[PDB]
Amino acid sequence: GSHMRKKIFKPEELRQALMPTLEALYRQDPESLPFRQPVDPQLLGIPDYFDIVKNPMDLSTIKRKLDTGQYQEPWQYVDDVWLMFNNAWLYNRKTSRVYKFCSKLAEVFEQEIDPVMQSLG
Numbered sequence: 001g002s003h004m005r006k007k008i009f010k011p012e013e014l015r016q017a018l019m020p021t022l023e024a025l026y027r028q029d030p031e032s033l034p035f036r037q038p039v040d041p042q043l044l045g046i047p048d049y050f051d052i053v054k055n056p057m058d059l060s061t062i063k064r065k066l067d068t069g070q071y072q073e074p075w076q077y078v079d080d081v082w083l084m085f086n087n088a089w090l091y092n093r094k095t096s097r098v099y100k101f102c103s104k105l106a107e108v109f110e111q112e113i114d115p116v117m118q119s120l121g
């Protein structure tokens with residue numbers, strides 16, 4: 001149905017789409033919060049966060065791959081934000097707070113970043 005992979009993808013176009021999307025993530029203020037900014041194991045009281053989560057891919061880092069073009073394609077970006085949802089789903093072992101923060105994100109985020117990948121191409 002024309003989505004994900006289609007155009008040659010330039011970070012300027014990609015972002016045109018992947019920006020409002022990552023934004024839809026951010027608008028979830030807390031729900032996106034364990035992602036937007038580095039989880040901050042020093043803050044959340046986490047010692048081995050970068051041991052548990054191999055790729056927390058903060059919504060700031062993802063937004064960066066966007067500002068710089070470290071994806072060459074939108075789904076690579078979604079892979080990052082889903083890489084994020086992962087640190088949520090890998091650490092919060094499905095039964096924690098940020099787990100709900102993410103699950104909701106994935107819900108909204110993609111609810112926008114899906115037709116976005118399509119919007120994009």
Ligand SMILES: O=S(=O)(O)c1ccc(/N=N/c2ccc(O)cc2)cc1
Nearest residue numbers: 030033034039044091092096097098
């Ligand atoms: O900025 S806050 O809204 O105050 C806040 C509060 C708690 C948070 N917890 N983050 C976690 C991340 C991983 C984990 O396994 C457990 C917790 C993160 C942010």
